[PDB]
Amino acid sequence: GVFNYETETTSVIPAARLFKAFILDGDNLVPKVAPQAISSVENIEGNGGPGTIKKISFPEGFPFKYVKDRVDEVDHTNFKYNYSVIEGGPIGDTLEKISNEIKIVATPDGGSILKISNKYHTKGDHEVKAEQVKASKEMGETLLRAVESYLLAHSDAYN
Numbered sequence: 168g169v170f171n172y173e174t175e176t177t178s179v180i181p182a183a184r185l186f187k188a189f190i191l192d193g194d195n196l197v198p199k200v201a202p203q204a205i206s207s208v209e210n211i212e213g214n215g216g217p218g219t220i221k222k223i224s225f226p227e228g229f230p231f232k233y234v235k236d237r238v239d240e241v242d243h244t245n246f247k248y249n250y251s252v253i254e255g256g257p258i259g260d261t262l263e264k265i266s267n268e269i270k271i272v273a274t275p276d277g278g279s280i281l282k283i284s285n286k287y288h289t290k291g292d293h294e295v296k297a298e299q300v301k302a303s304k305e306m307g308e309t310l311l312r313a314v315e316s317y318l319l320a321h322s323d324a325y326n
């Protein structure tokens with residue numbers, strides 16, 4: 168079955184620029200700015216569109232070694248990006264997949280809001296509780312603030 172967890176968080180970066188830097192070029196940018204959270208991102212197959220597979224590796228000592236993401240949909244107009252965690256780490260006999268959706272919306276102050284939905288597809292009577300998905304949110308937040316810090320400091324990047 169499916170457990171749906173939704174959150175929002177704010178960014179000080181405008182939606183289009185954040186979408187281009189953090190989501191689209193996130194494969195280059197995230198390991199450079201947050202190497203203590205993400206050790207590398209390997210493109211396995213594809214050019215970034217639906218069906219593209221990436222292997223996200225975590226630093227030594229983390230609970231999980233890696234996950235593989237599959238890009239599902241990329242909407243450049245509405246700054247929506249949908250991807251699934253389909254292998255690795257927690258994926259196995261208790262968790263089949265995680266289907267994720269990020270949408271970035273402009274705020275009139277020149278920042279953005281990130282709307283996130285994470286759907287945990289389980290196998291068995293295995294439960295996913297808000298407490299534990301908190302680590303997903305903490306990760307996301309750390310990555311976001313690392314990207315924002317970079318973008319604030321490198322004004323000519325991703326315009």
Ligand SMILES: C[C@H](CCC(=O)O)[C@H]1CC[C@H]2[C@@H]3CC[C@@H]4C[C@H](O)CC[C@]4(C)[C@H]3C[C@H](O)[C@]12C
Nearest residue numbers: 189190193194197205223265285303306307310
């Ligand atoms: C795999 C987790 C957890 C999501 C969940 O619990 O469902 C998510 C949380 C934040 C995600 C990252 C956001 C920044 C990057 C976005 C890129 O387009 C793909 C690589 C990165 C580095 C992502 C890798 C991976 O997709 C992460 C680490």
Ligand SMILES: C[C@H](CCC(=O)O)[C@H]1CC[C@H]2[C@@H]3CC[C@@H]4C[C@H](O)CC[C@]4(C)[C@H]3C[C@H](O)[C@]12C
Nearest residue numbers: 225229230231232257262295299300302303306
């Ligand atoms: C808490 C859920 C659900 C696990 C389950 O079904 O039992 C699991 C599923 C995906 C997991 C994430 C995968 C990517 C990351 C791996 C890191 O090495 C630890 C932090 C992250 C951000 C993990 C946090 C947490 O461990 C999650 C969100």
